[PDB]
């Protein structure tokens, strides 16, 4: 009847949170662990984990477990803070082809200058 | 919805700002007396400016599942832009 959801240790960078929505509608919000009571036959419990990563981590992985049960829910993280531009592969006029195209930004070669390497 | 950073200077410096910040990369965005960093911004400020949709840059985090007994899933990858949750449902029942 008293089922509660944890995860192992982890590094300071991730945090996790529980929202069990236990039964008869109960609904307990952000806490450390997942907790219910009760549980009838066949009666499924959902808790929503919310992790937040406070800075780009290198992945790695971990575990979610109901104490008192065998069962693992294997979590992989990664991290999501890369930005996937356009780049100048079919244009040789962009940043008048003197220049690499990053995100909207012209990087020009060397001897080359102006916000579109069109200057020198 | 709120963006505070500083000088950035590419698109991952804006990212590395908050979970609200996005990046512009229209070309010729920046104006004469503006530095690279108004590129970065919340996405109602840069659709303000005249940023179209689809060149406004916004990692954002995703939860993807796979797939018993008492818990389901059994595996679960997560992409985090760091301060942005990532939210997906266990199930219990046994
Ligand atoms: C986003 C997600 O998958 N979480 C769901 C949430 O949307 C839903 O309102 C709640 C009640 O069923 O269960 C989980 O918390
Ligand atoms: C894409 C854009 O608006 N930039 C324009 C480019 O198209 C044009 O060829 C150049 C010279 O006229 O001036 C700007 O670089």
Redesign the interface.
Known sequence: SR?F?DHNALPDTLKVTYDSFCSNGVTHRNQPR?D?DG?Q?????????????????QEQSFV???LG?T????????????????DQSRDRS?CHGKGFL????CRCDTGYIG??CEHH | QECTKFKVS???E???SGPGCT????????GPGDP?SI?CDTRPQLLMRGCAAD?I?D????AETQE???????????????????????????
Not at chain 1, 71 to 86: F, G, S
Not at chain 2, 59 to 62: A, D, E, F, R
């Open positions: 089922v959801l997942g219910c549980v036959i066949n009666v499924p419990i959902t808790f929503q984990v919310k992790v937040t990563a406070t800075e780009c981590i979610i477990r109901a049960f069962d693992i829910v294997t979590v992989q993280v990664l991290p999501q803070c890369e930005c996937r531009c356009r962009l990053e995100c909207g930004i916000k579109n | 590419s698109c991952r804006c990212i590395e990046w512009c990369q229209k070309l010729n965005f920046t690279d590129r060149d840059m990692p954002t985090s995703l018993q007994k008492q818990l389901s899933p059994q595996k679960v990858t997560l992409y985090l832009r760091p301060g942005q949750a990532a939210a997906f449902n266990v199930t219990f029942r046994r």
